[PDB]
Design a protein around this nucleic acid. Sequence first.
DNA 1: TAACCGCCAAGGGGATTACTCCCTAGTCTCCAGGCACGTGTTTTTTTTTTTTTTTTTTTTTTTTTTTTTCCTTTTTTTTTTTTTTTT
Length: 49
Amino acid sequence: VIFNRQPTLHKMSMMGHRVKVLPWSTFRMNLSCTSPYNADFDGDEMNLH
DNA sequence: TAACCGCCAAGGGGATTACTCCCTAGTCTCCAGGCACGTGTTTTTTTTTTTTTTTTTTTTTTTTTTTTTCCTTTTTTTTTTTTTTTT
């Protein structure tokens, strides 16, 4: 799947990922994604395609 | 108080006559500046293209996501039906 955070300022702000199914209603990913996505986990809404 | 007149005295130079001489009047003859005709090269006028600043027009303003609220006409003129009064 395609994983994208807005605003996309550069090439590295949307990746491809492999789906792992987890019960809870949030998106779960590795911490090292926080630097290319410029994410802060403080209410960041983010898209999957 | 000396102008003016009368009287007298003295002298100076313009008029007159004659001789001379020399400069111009007149007449050829050659030739050259004075003048009639043509025109010019600067001067002004007009176009021509650019320049330079001012003014006007137009277009622009990071992305994604989630909730309400209000409104989505309105007065103003014309028409048409209804009701009341009169003979």
